[PDB]
Amino acid sequence: MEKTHVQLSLPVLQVRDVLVRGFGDSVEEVLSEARQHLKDGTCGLVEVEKGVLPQLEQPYVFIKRSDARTAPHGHVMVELVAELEGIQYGRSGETLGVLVPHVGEIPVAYRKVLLRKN
Ligand SMILES: Nc1n[nH]c2cccc(Cl)c12
């Protein structure tokens, strides 16, 4: 059965390499698809800098920091928050990046996270 949190190492992708630039067309769909890709090992992370979000597709799925002393086993505790037309669905901490499908792009790094499944 599902533990509340799972340790994952996410590939960090450069925005110009990403082939599939979002998870879907509604807040509920992108959160659902992001969770499925995380379970399947087919999710990447793009770090947000100027110019990144306009090169990706809304709705966005962000991973955000969920606490301050929980970095168990070297993995930052995180949760999912979606954004569409400037409104956020969830409230959480600082953004670590934006999640996208991973379809074989070569990463530049890995980001260790402890992900709250729901
Ligand atoms: N990463 C995940 N492994 N297993 C899951 C089940 C539900 C939701 C998620 Cl995100 C996961």
2 lines ligand 1 (CB under 6 A): yes
> For 57, how many CA atoms within 13 A lie in the half-sphere containing its CB?
13
Neighbours of 61 (CB within 10 A): 27
Cα–Cα distance between 78 and 62 in angstroms, integer? 10
Cα–Cα distance between 105 and 20 in angstroms, integer? 10
Cα–Cα distance between 23 and 42 in angstroms, integer? 12
Count how many domains the chain has: 1
Q: Which of 26, 20, 72 is nearest to 46 (CA)?
A: 20
39 lines ligand 1 (CB under 6 A): yes
Question: Atom 1 in ligand 1: which residue has the minimum CA distance?
Answer: 39
Residue entry with tokens 């990144």:
52
Which experimental approach was used here? X-ray
Question: Atom 11 in ligand 1: which residue has the minimum CA distance?
Answer: 39
- Domain span holding position 14: 1-118
33 lines ligand 1 (CB under 6 A): no
